Symmetry: D2
Subunit: 130 residues, 4 copies
């Protein structure tokens, strides 16, 4: 069954979108958005409920105060955090990949704590139900 409903997107965005998807080969906006929605579901299902999940927390930030804050938080979740990889990107940007495994609820907690940390510009999760 198909459900029709309205949606409002900033004009400039809709134009780029319409252009991109016609090129790609989509028949219309709905076909293109159903695909975006299928991937979104696949990327975030892990959040529904509280099962054990594993994955990575990628974050970008720049330099000390935050670097010690990230460490201390890695100490708090000794059980869910396996290890973290730090790569010095450029001059005002550092890359941190944090490997985690545990109850989705604690992972969501660690995440919120990282993203809402002074110095952390962004953060993305690639997480899946183990």
């Amino acid at each position: 069954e198909l459900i029709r409903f309205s949606i409002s997107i900033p004009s400039k965005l809709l134009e780029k979108f319409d252009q991109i998807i016609e090129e790609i080969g989509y028949e219309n906006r709905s076909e293109a958005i159903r695909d975006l929605i299928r991937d979104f579901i696949i990327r975030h299902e892990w959040e529904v409920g509280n099962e054990e999940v594993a994955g990575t927390i990628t974050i970008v930030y720049n330099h000390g105060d935050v670097v010690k804050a990230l460490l201390d938080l890695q100490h708090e979740y000794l059980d869910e955090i396996i290890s973290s990889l730090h790569v010095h990107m450029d001059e005002h940007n550092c890359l941190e990949v944090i490997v985690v495994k545990g109850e989705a609820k604690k992972i969501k907690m660690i995440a919120d704590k990282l993203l809402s940390l002074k110095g952390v510009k962004h953060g993305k999760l690639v997480m899946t139900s183990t």
Copy 2:
């Protein structure tokens, strides 16, 4: 700016599962959620065609008995020697393995690395997360 309204047709079953997740994520409504999906979609397509200078990570969770992800990676480490900065591997449990690689380079090549690694059989989940200058992270 200017918010434009338009219709969409989506399978009910897909819409239900969608509503439940944006719910849990804390999205205001479907429009706000769909807007983000669209914006990220565009931002990645643009970095692609524009072959922008991106940095990031490629996460792969795969089946130990099925996937030969590591071998695949070691091969690529020679072609894209400049792109692949660091590789981390983790045996999570009896079935799941996690391979995360840090890449830096031109979007087209980096997307090439992702495409390959993600197509390997044995992969359960995986994604390329890249930024250009720390302004976006998709």
Copy 3:
């Protein structure tokens, strides 16, 4: 300080260069220099005395094009995933790959795992940096 005098046999070439270096560095004699070498050696291998908990790393160098050394390595690591926390793959050249394995566990088990890894064919070298946890 009870000094014990004993003799050892070392190939001339090695000893010649050793004497040259020792002189430069500013050592007075071979005994002094060898004592230092023996001191660092004890520190690096103490963790093997007994069977307490240790943590540290196993660094190996191997040719991934040789047979299925990669699948063998991965299988052995998967088997001991309780002691293997994480691994880093560092590319050297088209054939040579350097991997560093982070581990934690009873010294005895770690020795066992390391012996296996180094025993694999395709693995050229291996080195361990270990220390007991706590103090």
Copy 4:
């Protein structure tokens, strides 16, 4: 081609040495010291010839004491070329393990390691490297 010579070593060290020698598997002192001398020569040569090397710096430390976190950031700035990446692992209440992937000139890699290791809070640590894969010291 063997040269035989006499050496003077303090008694307690010799005991701990023989003790380590037995556990490890060496047949005799000569065979063990030969390996120590050879490894020493390989590291020294790489340094004076400031040759190119790849390797790792493993450091186990007390995160409640050491400034490691800081010393690393600082070093990750002056030598952002030789330092490829860093793996951090919180093992237990106290103990922290840091593994730094390095690649560059021996003298600089050596400086980086010496600075990080001579540090406070560091229980144990070592720079493990190879030039072309024929030797791992």
